Structures are given as structure tokens and as C-alpha cells.
Amino acid sequence: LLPDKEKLLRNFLRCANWEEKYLYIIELGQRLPELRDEDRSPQNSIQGCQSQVWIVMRQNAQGIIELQGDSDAAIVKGLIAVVFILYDQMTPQDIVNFDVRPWFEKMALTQHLTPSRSQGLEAMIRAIRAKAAALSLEHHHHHH
Amino acid sequence: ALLPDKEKLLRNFLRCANWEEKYLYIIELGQRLPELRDEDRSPQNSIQGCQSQVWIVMRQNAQGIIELQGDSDAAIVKGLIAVVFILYDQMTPQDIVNFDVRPWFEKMALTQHLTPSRSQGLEAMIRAIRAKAAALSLEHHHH
């Protein structure tokens, strides 16, 4: 399976150099479960990642998010796994108020990946939070 | 192959803006290598110590120039092969023997920030080539 966020950060920082870090991210991506051919459709497409990206978020029998995704770009799929780890086992509202910025700063991703890659990472985060917000946002009564 | 010359190659590396762009450029250089002749890929032209399958075939044409072709099992290593071919482009065996690559690898910081084996594999292919070059350099061309 995928390590929790605490272990991800510790293993990442334990890598002796950036090639090891880069291949570790890709390795995690390859560990993601296969995406149902049925879910690999436009409805689940994410734009702005310089590649094909698919992400599906659904709530189980309880109110906890279950995330699945894929990318035709290995490094992008790895970033998908990194975000899944950080948002793992959270309710929609937990995802909305969870600040991931400090985790990425510690990993120093934006400083080692291409700007285009970093933008793709921001796009998926924004897309996941958007989906989490649509499930928890307030429909204020003064707006009915 | 259609690749920049040493001089251009170096400038290109200097322009890389981040670890990833540089890493992928090395992979790109490998992707620019012509495919090896169907089974030119022999245990003979096999290089060892590159933490992967590496093949390099050396040839000397009618003009005494060394022509090199290669391929690797690992994309990054194949990029390192491409770099080596560019450095030795259009050289005679003797040229390859007295060419000090050290200053070039140093300015490119080629294997820096890569896993340890990369610089080991790089050293492997260089000694392999220099070895063959020296052998040929003892038997001189015409003039």
C-alpha cells in the first residue's frame, strides 16, 4: 500500500540525492491501484498537468473520501500518489481545512521540478479540494 | 546522431533551470541515439559495471575517424552514453586517447545529484572506449 504522510516525508528526506527522490515519487505512483476503464473518462479528467490525468473522489458507506487516479505520465502519477497520501483517510471538511503547503515546502518540490510539473501539482490539489468543498460547503439560507 | 556538439551541449546543460529539466535532458540525449543494428547488440560490444545492460560498438571509417553507436537498458545511462558520444564526436583513436573528459564532466556537473552508480557507470564506459582507442592508436593510418 502507500505509506502515511509522516513516513512519506521521512523516507523522502532520507533519500541521498534527487534522483533517488525522483524515482521514489515515481515508484509510489506505480503502486496506485488500477483505475477502472469506466472511471478513465472525461468526467474525471484533470486539466493543466501537461499530460492526461484522471482523478475520482467518492465517499464510502461512511463520510470518508476514497481516492483513485491515473496519469499517462509516470512522474505525474507519482505526484498523484503523494497528494493521495497527504489527504488519506479524511472527511471532505478535513480536506478543505488541511494545509498541505508546509509538507511540500519541506520536500522542496517546487524548487527541483519543472514549473510545468509544479503547476500540474497545484492543479490536482485545487481539483481535489474543489471536489471536497462541493461535498461540505455551506448552502447559506440567505442564498436560497 | 543529430545531437549538439560538445561546446553546445555544455551551454545547454548550463541553461537547465532545475534538477528535473536537467535530468530529463540527459534522458532526452539518450532518446536521440540511433537504434542499434539488429543484434549489433552482442556480448562482445557489451559494457559492464553500469548497473544495467550497456552496449557500445566502436568503428573506424576509411578516414580514420571513430564512429560510435550504443544503447542501454536504463534511460538515464543511455543519456550518459549519448554525452560520451558527443564528447568523442568525430575523433581519431589517438584523439580519444589524449582527450581529458574530466574538465568537461566537471563543468557539466553531469553525474552530480544522480545516484552514486551513475558516475561509476560513466567511468566504466570511458575506460572501455579509451582502451579500444589505444589499441587502434598503436597501429597508425597512412600519414
CA dihedral for B9, B13, B14, B15, sign (positive or negative): positive
Closest residue in A to B111 (Cα) is A19
β-strands B66-72, A45-46: how paired? unpaired
Q: Which of B26, B33, B47, B50 is labelled catalytic?
A: B50
Under the phi-then-psi rule, with left for phi > 0, alpha for psi from -120 to 50, and beta for the rest, what region is A48? left
Residue B54: how many other CB atoms lie within 10 Å: 24
Angstrom distance (rounded) from CA A81 to CA A84 = 5
CA B82 to chain centre: 5
Mutation target among B23, B25, B117, B118 for the A interface, most CBs of A within 10 A: B23
**Residues A55 and A67 sit within 8 Å (Cβ to Cβ):** yes
> Do residue B19 and residue A113 have CB atoms under 8 angstroms apart?
yes
The residues, ordered by sequence, that sit 6+ positions from A91 with a Cβ below 8 Å of its Cβ are A63, A64, A65, A136
Could you tell me the maximum CA-CA distance found in chain A, to the nearest angstrom? 56
**What is the distance in angstroms between the Cα of B76 and the nearest Cα belonging to chain A?**
10
Q: Which CATH number fits domain A1-144: 3.40.50.300, 3.40.50.1000, 3.50.50.60, 3.90.1010.10?
A: 3.90.1010.10
Query: What is the residue type of B135?
Result: A
Q: Which CATH number fits domain B1-143: 3.40.50.2300, 3.40.50.150, 1.10.760.10, 3.90.1010.10?
A: 3.90.1010.10
CB of A36 less than 8 A from some CB of B: no
Angstrom distance (rounded) from CA A10 to CA B25 = 29
Closest residue in B to A111 (Cα) is B18
The CB-side HSE value for A35 (13 A sphere, CA atoms) comes to 23
In A85-107, which positions are buried (b, 16+ CB within 10 angstroms) versus exposed (e)? Answer: bbbbebebeebbeeebeebbeeb
**Residues B6 and B89 sit within 8 Å (Cβ to Cβ):** yes
β-partners of residue B10 are none
**Residues B26 and B83 sit within 8 Å (Cβ to Cβ):** yes
The residues, ordered by sequence, that sit 6+ positions from B120 with a Cβ below 8 Å of its Cβ are B49, B50, B51
- Per DSSP (E only), the strands in chain A are 45-46, 53-59, 65-71
Name the residue facing A18 among B21, B24, B113 (closest C-beta): B113
B-chain residues near A112 (CB < 8 A): 18-20
> Do residue A113 and residue B20 have CB atoms under 8 angstroms apart?
yes
The CB-side HSE value for A21 (13 A sphere, CA atoms) comes to 21
The approach used to solve this structure was: X-ray
Question: What are the helix and strand counts (H, E) for chain A?
Answer: 7, 3
**What is the distance in angstroms between the Cα of A128 and the nearest Cα belonging to chain B?**
25
Angle between helices A18-31 and A74-86 (to 10 degrees): 80
DSSP-H helix ranges across A18-73: 18-31
Q: What is the resolution of this structure in A?
A: 2.0
Closest residue in A to B118 (Cα) is A19
Nearest of B69, B107, B82 to residue B5 by alpha carbon: B82
CA dihedral for B121, B124, B130, B133, sign (positive or negative): negative
Locate B107 and state its grid cell. 563543468
Residue-by-residue DSSP string for chain B: -----HHHHHHHHHH--SHHHHHHHHHHHHHTSPPPPTTT--STTEE-SSSS-EEEEEEE-TTS-EEEEEEESSHHHHHHHHHHHHHTTT--HHHHHT---HHHHHHHTTTTTS-THHHHHHHHHHHHHHHHHHHHHTS----
Q: Determine the length of chain B.
A: 143
